[PDB]
Amino acid sequence: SESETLNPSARIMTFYPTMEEFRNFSRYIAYIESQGAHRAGLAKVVPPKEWKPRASYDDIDDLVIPAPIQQLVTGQSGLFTQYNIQKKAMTVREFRKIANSDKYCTPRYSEFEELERKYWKNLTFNPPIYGADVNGTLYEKHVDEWNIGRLRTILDLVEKESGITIEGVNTPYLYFGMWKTSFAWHTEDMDLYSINYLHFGEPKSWYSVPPEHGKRLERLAKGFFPGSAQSCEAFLRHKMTLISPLMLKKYGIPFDKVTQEAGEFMITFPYGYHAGFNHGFNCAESTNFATRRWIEYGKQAVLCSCRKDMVKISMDVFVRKFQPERYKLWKAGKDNTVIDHTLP
Amino acid sequence: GGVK
Ligand SMILES: O=C(O)CNC(=O)C(=O)O
Ligand code: NI
Ligand SMILES: [Zn+2]
């Protein structure tokens, strides 16, 4: 098949759109999927040089991070659980001082390979503080291209039909990072896409497992954490589980890595597991989005069964609107559709 | 609903 020949190694692809290609968001997403980008689980988009979401980041020192989290990591030899201790609210100025202080700052290093080794060697020591999950945008109001606060995808059908706002999902989140702050192995809520823009600062490094080997990572994770597997049908959604790339290689799980630098977008695709860490003080904005291709993923997403506050989106509106033939069959519980991860 |  044509889709199977495109990005056959399911390697992370990087795109450099011109201003003209960049303008239409959902069309650019269709385009990168036409090149097989979605096979990686992650893609990088470098916006055109003369594109800017904000004039200056010099006025945000007084921005409140209301729920900073200290990240206590426990484990050894490639397998870790991250526990999140919430600290009292702090401003960006308070945060950046701590981020750059001799205590928390990025170690000296030659190339990324050495910084990555320092990450995996030291991540259970000196628990860092992540300014994660902050409600807001750093985009200026007038910015029409790739505006994370208004992408205009069909995910907008959720609020449109129901009025329901899900923070970070159909609203933007800001993430102020410092050295060694991390994000655990997860796919998106409801196996949605995510967009992630690094406004400023040091890089954010990412790992990704192709959606086509996603179940292979889950099988590994369940074997490594059998107690968690029995408690919850989707324990990785707790976003507590860290697994080093050496551990993935040891068990034959395909994965790729990429480093996002200030000014670049990352796109994660439905069912693409990703994890990563920040190099130093930075700020990222992020939200979820959807395309028609996400819809079967949404329908088949396995959700966390042990927390009451987890994200669940009714699929009803999407199946009625975009799969009217299958609606009654899906309702009778007899829709046997198999997802083909390569297909755009 | 929920929260991310
Ligand atoms: O930046 C972070 O801490 C994590 N971001 C994501 O997982 C994402 O955009 O999907
Ligand atoms: Ni994510
Ligand atoms: Zn759970």
Among the listed residues A288, A308, A309, A290, the one whose alpha carbon sits nearest the alpha carbon of residue A299: A290
Ligand 1 contact via A183 beta carbon (within 6 Å): yes
**A134 with A180: CB under 8 angstroms?**
no
Residue type, A56: S
Q: Is residue A60 left, alpha or beta, with left meaning phi > 0 and alpha meaning psi from -120 to 50?
A: alpha
Which residues, 6 or more positions from A209, have their beta carbon under 8 angstroms from its beta carbon?
Answer: A41, A185, A216, A217, A248, A253, A254, A255, A272, A273, A274
Please name the method used to determine this structure: X-ray
> Quick one: resolution in A?
2.0
3-class DSSP state for residue A96? Answer: helix
Torsion of CA A95, A184, A33, A301, to 10 degrees: -120
The pairing of beta strand A13-15 with beta strand A42-45: parallel
CA-to-CA dists, residue A250 to A240, A271, A320, angstroms: 21, 22, 44
What are the residue boundaries of the structural domains of chain A, listed by start?
A: 12-344
Tokens read off for A192: 């949605």
Active site amino acids of A: 168, 175, 186, 188, 274, 286
Contacts of A310 in chain B (CB under 8 A): 2
Q: Which residue has the tokens 């990450």?
A: A119
Q: How far apart are CA A75 and CA A320, in angstroms?
A: 46
Q: How far apart are CA A197 and CA A54, in angstroms?
A: 12
Residue A245 has phi, psi (to 5 degrees) of -60, -30
Under CATH, what is the fold of the domain A12-344? Jelly Rolls (2.60.120)
Q: How far apart are CA A204 and CA A162, in angstroms?
A: 35
**A302 with A234: CB under 8 angstroms?**
yes
Most B CBs within 10 Å: which of A86, A161, A162, A169, as the mutation test of the B interface? Answer: A169
**A265 with A47: CB under 8 angstroms?**
yes
3-class DSSP state for residue A282? Answer: strand
3-class DSSP state for residue A246? Answer: helix
Q: How far apart are CA A221 and CA A217, in angstroms?
A: 6
